[model samples]
Target: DNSVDLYFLMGLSGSAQGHLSNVQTLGSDLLKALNEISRSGRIGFGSIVNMTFQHILKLTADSSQFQRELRKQLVSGKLATPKGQLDAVVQVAICLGEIGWRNGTRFLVLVTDNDFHLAKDKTLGTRQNTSDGRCHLDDGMYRSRGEPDYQSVVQLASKLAENNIQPIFVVPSRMVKTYEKLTTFIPKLTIGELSDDSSNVAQLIRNAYSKL
Candidate 1:
């Protein structure tokens, strides 16, 4: 007995136009598809929770409180780090888990272009016992790193599995190379190619839900 939780990573800047209109259209289309499926009565015991980490950056101003917190967390090692981001996701997943436990049906959908920077090869720097005082992707003023935390993303998937929540990843075709590496670990991962016309989003969601 669990509830479905759909988590979307959105996409990076260049892969998709981070334009407001595009984002709105994508979200609306996704919800529309979900509504259709729900009304079809095929999956009787599930609920959809939609979220985008991309919006985190948008809602906050250049020097807003959220921006400050993000900077402090990233720079201070309180967040931004792979483990830190994993912890944050775990907290959120726990809340979602509780909801799922109550409803008896839950699924976590992660939508993204699969562009992430892993901590491997010393790219993320040396491990520290305490804060490093430098943000991972901070611009010295505002804005967190635009890259996804690959380790955190994987850890989140593991956590979801442990908690009995299915994790669905919807990645763009342009990111096939990256998603290939992840597929070994996340066998359930779903990759969707973007169409020249823009119908790929709808197709991707449908394909992911079918796997459920």
Candidate 2:
């Protein structure tokens, strides 16, 4: 199918260590598979913990740098509750230049284990403030902690659609149903199965590409 694909993978820390490892391995495999089927391909990696977003690498075509950054910066830690995954998604949507998004088929692969904090959730740091859905990234990292509410599912779906970025949610089987509801509003959203160790992630992304 000779397409152009850009993939940005965002992972949750602590509970998703194994899943994140799978994301690292999948990067090389993605480079291989896309190189064969796509005319051009690029991939980037990032992670979120306790509402802060860290961009490990911007999208690039170099396989070595992808692996190198994964090895050096894929450090994992702990989070006691829901992560800022939805907020990170909004940032990825709004911060197109920062994320290196191009005029190609864009994919945001979310690798997470727990549920996410949503808008108006009392648990969110800025529950009282409504999110503007604007890019709050600063210095290559998301710096607006406690400034805006997390994006609601409705808002998140629209943001992805507006940015023309398909979202592939690779979450544990137990959480599939929770995210499947998103497909109702997110036209290009896809749900993929994730094993505890994320051994099947490569195949999952491959399968996701098949339907498109």
Candidate 3:
């Protein structure tokens, strides 16, 4: 079996957080499988924890302690609200992989329907809201706050590539096209979409990393 370290970077705001329930179900099953695998001596078990964005919840492969911490973090409903903080949260997610720089395949599962902030909110000199709804890839307008620019996204991609991190997106089908453009920018990313049009999330995750 080929084992890898997966870091799930869920957007803890807006409709994105709605996907967590499906993730919770998958995580439970995933934990059991990881426990079985590591027990069989194929590889070492791993962990996933939140470093930012309200600092809540986690998922792990092998350790009981880390799993306990993860469960404790998710007990609070604080991380499930709508804050519209995609750009900053994404940067934090990037740091999780680079700072630690793991030994195997690194995957950052992006669970959201958001567009990058791509730059600061200089047009008004203050943070402005784009819209309170989901965005299509080719749409004229989308939601964002003052944030990093296109070059910054490129740099982020470079950092991921340098660290051998693969950014896999588990987003709505509508946002899949946008991420097609995103993969162009990142060059080493994968996009996974749910099979249905309903709000159920993590079906993409279950398909993409189901064997893991």
**lDDT: which candidate is best?**
2
**TM value for model 2:** 0.85
- Identify the runs in model 3 with alpha carbons over 4 angstroms from their true place: 30-100, 122-151, 194-212
Q: Residue 146 deviation, candidate 1, in Å?
A: 14
Compute the lDDT for candidate 1. Answer: 0.37
> Clash number for model 2?
0
Clashes of each: 11, 0, 3
Off by over 4 Å in 2: 1-3, 75-79, 122-127, 196-212
Task: Supply candidate 1's per-residue lDDT for 149.
Answer: 28
**CA RMSD, predictions in order:** 10.8, 2.7, 9.7
lDDT of 3 by residue, 58-134 (tens): 32344554445434333223332322334432443444423243454555655554554453433344534332222
Cα error, candidate 3, residue 29 (Å): 3.8
Q: What Cα-based lDDT does every candidate model obtain?
A: 0.37, 0.70, 0.43
